[model samples]
Structure formats: structure tokens, C-alpha cells
Target: EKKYIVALDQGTTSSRAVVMDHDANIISVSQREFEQIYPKPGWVEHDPMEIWATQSWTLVEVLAKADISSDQIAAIGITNQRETTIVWEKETGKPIYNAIVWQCRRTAEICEHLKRDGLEDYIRSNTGLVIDPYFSGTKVKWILDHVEGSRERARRGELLFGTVDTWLIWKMTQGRVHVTDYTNASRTMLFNIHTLDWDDKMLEVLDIPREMLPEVRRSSEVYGQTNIGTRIPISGIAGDQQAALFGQLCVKEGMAKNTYGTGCFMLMNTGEKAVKSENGLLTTIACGPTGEVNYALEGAVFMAGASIQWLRDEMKLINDAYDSEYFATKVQNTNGVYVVPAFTGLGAPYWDPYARGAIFGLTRGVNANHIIRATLESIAYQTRDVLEAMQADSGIRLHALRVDGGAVANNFLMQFQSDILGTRVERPEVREVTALGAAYLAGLAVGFWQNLDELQEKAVIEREFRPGIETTERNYRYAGWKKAVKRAMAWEEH
Candidate 1:
């Protein structure tokens, strides 16, 4: 009998596959890190074929390592890096251009144009997203406009456009399917979160053909079946942040989860109510199950763990990302230094597209340890910026933040996050919650798990970081972050 569910977690820097049993415990896993293409400063792209091949390869290896046959896998769930856009040939399934990563700033000019033309309010009202390159709409338009005869082909319905989730489903089913769930669709800025359909006005403004869009589906339905050697059913789909929200069991209204990865994403479950943001927070589709869509308000910190990665790879200050913790602990404080890692730009609340990275209050006495410590604290500061806006928008105070992802493994960072927020930070024993969420959704649809209650009962706490810092200290530190952010934004204008 089929007893296992599989999750494909395609992330910014790596592809991971996880197998879970009925109890929601991870059985086995496989992962592969792929090359990130940084063609020029502030531009990011991924070869669609590379992402597809690496993810497929990892899935096969994970299943093999678990000693599970394809027949034994009940269903497959996918959670991918959201907002990465790809346009491909419908007949050949070949991408016309490289996948534009969420971090890519290529469409900043387009967003500026839209904002200047007073179309930002219309987009925000309809799509529940701000005008930005990080969203999929402009990226899709960029491809159509630049590629030779691409616009004509798209208009003729010979091309297809999708975020990573739709592309993966298309490959998994061998072009038999092209669909995205509410969570992924909401990130596109082309889908109306309230109506749960592609907005014709958005399509027209972006010069995108309606035919290039995918059929949007619910999160837990059987969208299609895998036809590779495995031949398993594809039963779940969600963007990575929403998958983390589900994995954290934030099913009820007011429940929330914050994922610490390349970026820091805070998603608050608003249940079925689509609350518009008066603040800079985005109103987005949380997830849909059994054809019922739930809504969420999301705040994004553009650089989180990626700042630490930059220190290791670009600054040569640390050999590994983990080494930053040791260096950070050496200094009791940042010695008045602050690193605002607005490398791409500021996201959420601020939404400053022209912002650039800047380090402020640095002195000659400040060493690499101080710089590293400041970088780590900058993440906490950024989170506070978003959380404040979230609270303002939703009028709900967070009792605690359920956290997950690679950066959560850093006890120092997690503790600091709790201190900064003045709220308990809960970390699960299973750090692979993003993938686990996907597995749970797939398992439920295939009857491997009965419902969310069963899955939540199996969730075990690894550790909890309680708020330990003085309120005054937290406020003082956050003020420094705000000042540093102002300086960073000024760099763009200069």
C-alpha cells in the first residue's frame, strides 16, 4: 500500500526533496545546490532547464535513498521559490529566455513607469500587490517585449508564461498540465486575489496575452499526475512562504509564520477575509484547500540570510555561513556599525526600489567581527521593521512567531530575533517545515493523513527562544536600523 508522500522544495540556491511518513516525520531527503547566475550588478537569473534538471534529479535520489518505490508514493507536493518568471514554447516546452529570479531588479524601470503613470493604485487595489520587479507581471512583459517575435507568438497563443510552480507542474506531467495554486498566483501581480482570477486589466496594462496565463487551482487538489518513471500523483502546490505557513499549522485566523531564508517573509493568516493593507504590507492569497481560498497579509525583508552568504562569499570574512555566529558572539555589540543589506532593494512597508546596500556608523576600530555581528543584527532589525508595519495593518499583535528555514538553525539569530521582536520565537524540531508542509498537503489529499489536526498533533518543538532583552534596548537598536535604512535609500538617489 502507498504510505509515503513526497515534497519537491525548489529554492533560490538549491533543490531539495523530502519523503515523509503518515506521522509527518521526515523519512529521507536529498539536496543539490545549483549555480546562481548574477549576470550584472542587481540582476539575477536562473536557467530554467538547470532548475528543472536539478530538482528532478534530487527527487529521484531522495526516493532511492528512502528505499521507496514510485508506487509506494501516494502523492507529490511542490513548494517553489515564488515570483521567478519563465516564458516557454507551448509545443516544445522550451523556455524562450532565462527565468527571472525574484531578486532580479531588471524591471525596476517598468515599475517606476507604472507608478509614475498612476497605475500603482489600480494594481494594488485589484492584485493586492505593489508594483515591483520582484512580482511576475512585469518580468513576463519584459520577456515578451524583448524576445524576437515573442509578443506576436504570445498573442497568437503559441507561448506560455508561468512562475516556477507552473513550470514544474508542466515538466512533471510532461506538458499535460499548466496550472498554479492561489499562493503562487497571488505573487504574480497578474491574478486578482479577491476574485481569484487573472485580471484582464492587469493583463492589458502589462501587454500580456491572457492566453499565456495558466489555470489557477486550489492548493490541495490533484492538479495533475506525474508521468516520469515514478508516475506518482501531483496533489499539492504552493509558493514557499505559504507552504511554510501550512507547515507551521497557521490554519486559523491570526495564526502566522515567519520564514528566514534568503529573505525574511512574514505571513499572517487572515482566514477567508481579504484585508487590504493601509500600510505597505501586501494583501495576498494565503492558500486554498478543498477549493476554499484563504487570505494573508505578507511583509518581505529583501535580504536576510543572503546577507550572511554575502559576507562569506563576497567579503571573505567567514569560511562558511555558520562561522558568522562565532564571530558575531565575539563582539558584545556591533561597535556602532550597522549593515543595511539593501543589495537588491527594500521590500515591504518601505518598498524602496532604488535603495542600495550601505554600512553606517562604522569606525576604524570596527573589525570584521563587528561588521559580521552588525550584519546578523541587521536581519533582526529588518524583521522588526516589517512586523511593526504588519501590526499596524492587521491590528493584531503577535504573541509569538513560528519560525523555519536554514537561518533558524542559528540559535544566535533566532534568539536575537526573539529579543528584537519582544515575542517568543518558536522553532520546530523538523527544520524542513517548508518541504514537510508540502508533504502534509499532498498526504492529506491522498488519504495518507486524515486532516490538519493529525499533522499538528505530530509536530514537535525543537526549542523556543523567549524575549529576553529590555524594551528600551530593543527600541534604541531599532532606531539605528531606521537611520541606516534612510542612508541606504539616499545612495540610490545620489
Candidate 2:
């Protein structure tokens, strides 16, 4: 009997399950978009119950679609949106509140307080992360402080706090196991990457009890067996971007990948050494199949595809997202318009939670097409900002950027990205790279595949976009973007 690996890719907007065979080919896929709750302008929430329901449904549905038996599975890998915080009761297994999504800015004030009190340097050095609401610490603090009796319960070991991966694992195991991998743990500001344990100082400062946190584990070890399915080991685990980084075969030092999903995340593997960033890039853990952990320098763009979605749904500029490419190509340029998509706020290099989205350089002659073109260009320009910071921090000149996720199909966007960076942008044949990475990690842990070399040879680049414009032209346009971005910063006042 042949065996297959299942990858449950729990994302911000959707829950996806991908079934893969021995050759790294995706056999069957099932994805369902979940409801995104917005209690306020900057607050984002997801019902933990809905997340489990949709995720479990996709798993069962995908397995049945593939026509495979539960006994035929080798292992399970889980990859989820990093830093989304959830707290639940120990006895009833019910969440105290909705999952505080990573994109939520509800805890911005808490982050501001941390910065003002001069704890910023300690957090930056210990957690290898900047003090921002984008991380789990402040969000967890906000929940405990707001929810009545929750903090006392948490202190008494009656409550459990988890990132998405830990929640899923605990649920899958029927409350038997509560754990998270190094990759996921690193995203939580309470975890010390250097010590490979939860930082006591952070926990004390944030008022998060140590009992609420899940046990930290290696990336590819067998965590537990699934309660619903056959007694197959639930093995591999990673945060989404780290999994995508691994899936791109960027296991070697200095290799990198950029994922243009809801947000744009660029990560470069830095081997064993955790290279601290002088630039605004994050120093994080990168998970490998063999249980060896590496460090990564990551830059995040909070709005990418979400901005295009805005054009389609909110602005009514285009009927469909794909239509933006067609209409964008119709315009020779943006007509001097620049759209700064700081929807939630600017990330990487800037880290301005106060910044709001704006349109600059718009004139009377500019039409809908110019705005559309500029919107697409903004994604590329933001990527260049991160890439430049990445190169400066790591001292590695990237020859090409391995690209993945939904937006890579946009030829106009990819070419523009390459042209702006003066580098090559390579898109792989397999579009489901995030889920594939999780599958690879799970498959390797169970001896389904021998090693990384076996999987590395299978990745094939389908398209390559190289720079088309001159350096002088690219720099001039980028200078305008820098100016526009500066103007957009610090717009929101407390």
C-alpha cells in the first residue's frame, strides 16, 4: 500500500489541506475561506471553534477526495499564521475569547508603552524581535487584561495560551498534547531564541503565566497521534513563512524566498548564526526536517494582495483581481500616482503602526487605470524596500528571489518586482509551496523520503522574470516611493 502526507495550512483568511504523494506532487487540495471578524477599525478576530471546524473539514474532505484511507498516511504537518494568539480553558477546552489575529492593532498601545519604558532594547536582543503588536506578547497581555478572571485563571494553571499551531495540535490530540515548534515559538515575544525557552522576564512583564504557554519542541519530531484518524504520528510543524522558506529548498545558508500571500513575507536562511539586524528585519528561527534549527532574517509587508482585493471590493475600480493586471498594462505608467498601502500599518524597515494608506502624486489627468497601476507597483516597491534592507543586514547580494503564493501569477507584478530590484524573480511550477513544505517536513520525519536531497531535486522553476529597466530609471521611481512613504508615516495620532 502507498502512503501519503497531509499538510494542514491554516492561514489568515482561509484553511487549506493539501495531500501529497512520494514525488512532492500535490494529489488533492481542499480550501475554505473563513469569516474574518473586525470588531473595530484596527481589531481583527477569528473564532477558534470556526477555525478548527473548517480545518478539520478540509482535512477529511481532501483525504476523501484523494480516495485514500487514513491508514495510508505517513504523517501530518501543520503550518499556520504566525503570532495569532489564543487562550483557552484547561478543563472545558473552550477559548476564552476569539483568536487575536496577527494583523490586529488592538494592542498597539501596549507596544507603545513597552517602547516608551525602554524595554525595547531588551526585547530586541532577547526575543530577536522588535516590540510591536504584530507579535504575540502584547496581544496575549491585552486578552488577559481585558477578559475578567482570565489572568487569575491563567496564573493558577487553569488557562492555556497558544499560537495557532499549538491550538490545532492540542485539538487533534483530544487535549492530550499541547506543544509548538521552535519556528512558531520564536514569533511570540516571550520566547528566547538564544536560550530556546520561554523568557521569564518577558512573561513577568507581559503578566503571562508560564503555565499558559505550550511546550516548545523541534520542528520535525513526532508530536502526537491524531484522535480522529489512524494512529499515524502528527510530526512536522512550522509557521507559514518558515514552511514556505523550507519548501523553496532554501535550506542552505543565504538562500531565500518571498511569499506574496495576504501579506508579503521575505525570509533568508542564515544557517546556525542568528544574524542580528541593524536594519528592521526580524531574526527568527528556520525549521528543517532533520530537527536542525537555523536562523532567518525576515521582512514583512502587512499589505500586498489585500491591497488588490481592496481595489476590487472596496474601491470598485476593477470587477475581479485579475482584471487589475489587464487594466494596469493598458497604462504606460502610474501618471505620477503612488499608492502607499499601509492598510493596517507599514511593516519592515518602517514599523509604523500609526501610518495609514494614502495616494500621493495624483493629478487631474490621472484616471482609474493610473491608480490601479500604482497599486500593483506598490507591492513591488515595498518588496524592494525589504530586499535592500535584507542585503544590507546580511551582506549577501541576492541574484534572484524565489517567489510563491497567489500573486506570483501576475506577470506584470513579477516583472515589475524584478525591474525595481534589478534582480531575477523565479516562480516555481508548484503553486502550493506553503502546504508542500509542511508535507515535506512530515514525510521526512516518518522515513517516507530519505533526505532533503531527494526532495530538493524535484523543485522546478516554471518562469523567470529579469530586470528590464535601467538602474537610473528604477532609482528615480524608487526615490519617489520613499518620499511618498515618509509622508504617510506617523499620520495616526493617539
Candidate 2 Cα outliers beyond 4 Å, as residue runs: none
- Candidate 1: lDDT of 123? 83
In the range 337-422, model 2's lDDT, one tens digit per residue, is 99999888787889998898999987899999999999999999999999999999999999999999999989999999999999
Q: Tens-digit lDDT track for model 1 on 131-232?
A: 888899989888888998898889898999898989998998888898988889989998877688989888888889988889988888888788756578
Top TM-score: which candidate number?
A: 2
> What's the distance in Å from true for residue 342, model 1?
0.8
- The best candidate by lDDT is 2
Candidates' RMSD to native: 1.5, 1.2
lDDT of each: 0.85, 0.89
lDDT of 1 at 214: 90
